[PDB]
Amino acid sequence: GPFDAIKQPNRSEEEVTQLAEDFKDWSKASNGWRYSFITANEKEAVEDFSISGYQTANDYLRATDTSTWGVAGADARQYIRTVKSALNKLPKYKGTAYRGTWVKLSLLNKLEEGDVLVEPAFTSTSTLPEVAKRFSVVHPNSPQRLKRVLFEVKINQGGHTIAGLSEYSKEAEVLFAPNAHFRITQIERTSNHTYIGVETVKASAVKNTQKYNLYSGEEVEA
Numbered sequence: 001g002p003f004d005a006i007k008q009p010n011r012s013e014e015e016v017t018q019l020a021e022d023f024k025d026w027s028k029a030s031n032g033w034r035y036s037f038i039t040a041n042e043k044e045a046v047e048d049f050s051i052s053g054y055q056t057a058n059d060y061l062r063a064t065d066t067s068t069w070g071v072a073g074a075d076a077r078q079y080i081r082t083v084k085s086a087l088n089k090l091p092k093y094k095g096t097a098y099r100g101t102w103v104k105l106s107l108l109n110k111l112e113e114g115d116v117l118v119e120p121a122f123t124s125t126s127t128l129p130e131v132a133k134r135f136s137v138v139h140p141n142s143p144q145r146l147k148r149v150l151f152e153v154k155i156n157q158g159g160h161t162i163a164g165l166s167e168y169s170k171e172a173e174v175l176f177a178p179n180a181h182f183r184i185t186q187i188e189r190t191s192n193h194t195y196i197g198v199e200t201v202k203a204s205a206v207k208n209t210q211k212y213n214l215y216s217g218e219e220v221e222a
């Protein structure tokens with residue numbers, strides 16, 4: 001089965017921890033000329049994104065109405081600009097990654113191979129399926145019907161490692177700037193869980209398919 005490896009249980013703590021440390025070391029080692037230009041504010045913004053920053057940033061990005069945010073809105077906009085700037089200075093990652101999440105059942109029921117999913121927030125992934133799984137275990141209180149999803153993401157563009165600035169974790173994290181587009185290559189719906197193979201695509205290259213907002217579930221105009 002295409003998702004057998006990720007349906008199976010996890011590798012040992014020792015191995016997962018080692019793989020994450022290896023990925024952190026690789027990430028630091030792959031810092032390039034763009035990295036010399038990373039500012040103090042950029043470094044800090046990214047360092048704290050994984051702990052707390054993502055909660056405000058992603059909320060802002062997914063909000064239907066930010067008119068009410070006041071000073072918080074100016075702050076969130078600044079933070080987002082700062083993290084986006086930093087991300088472009090960090091090393092690219094290409095290969096497979098994973099994302100554990102929740103999705104509206106109403107959206108899941110529409111999805112087919114070839115459809116494109118657009119995430120309005122930043123998109124967090126891990127190179128380690130063990131890490132990704134941890135994020136489909138509980139969700140905040142929610143008024144909609146949500147289902148667990150495990151994404152297997154083929155990354156050929158857009159993903160940058162933040163693991164070289166995440167000293168407190170073993171998360172092997174690869175982050176995407178807002179509005180990342182992912183084309184569905186395979187979907188399996190089994191025993192109340194959903195496994196979705198996706199590939200990164202350039203938004204300007206998407207043609208003659210259906211795009212969906214991954215968070216709201218609403219169609220996104222071609």
Ligand SMILES: NC(=O)c1ccc[n+]([C@@H]2O[C@H](COP(=O)([O-])OP(=O)(O)OC[C@H]3O[C@@H](n4cnc5c(N)ncnc54)[C@H](O)[C@@H]3O)[C@@H](O)[C@H]2O)c1
Pocket residue numbers: 049050051054055058098099100101102103104121123124125126131132133135136138139140146171172173174214215216
């Ligand atoms: N999700 C992953 O697999 C993953 C991978 C690497 C690191 N992380 C780490 O986890 C944190 C980021 O967590 P995240 O990726 O869940 O952040 P997120 O901002 O995407 O999601 C925040 C919360 O909302 C839920 N959510 C997201 N999209 C939803 C949707 N369409 N409908 C309903 N609920 C939805 C999430 O499951 C989570 O409970 C950071 O600390 C980051 O370092 C997560």
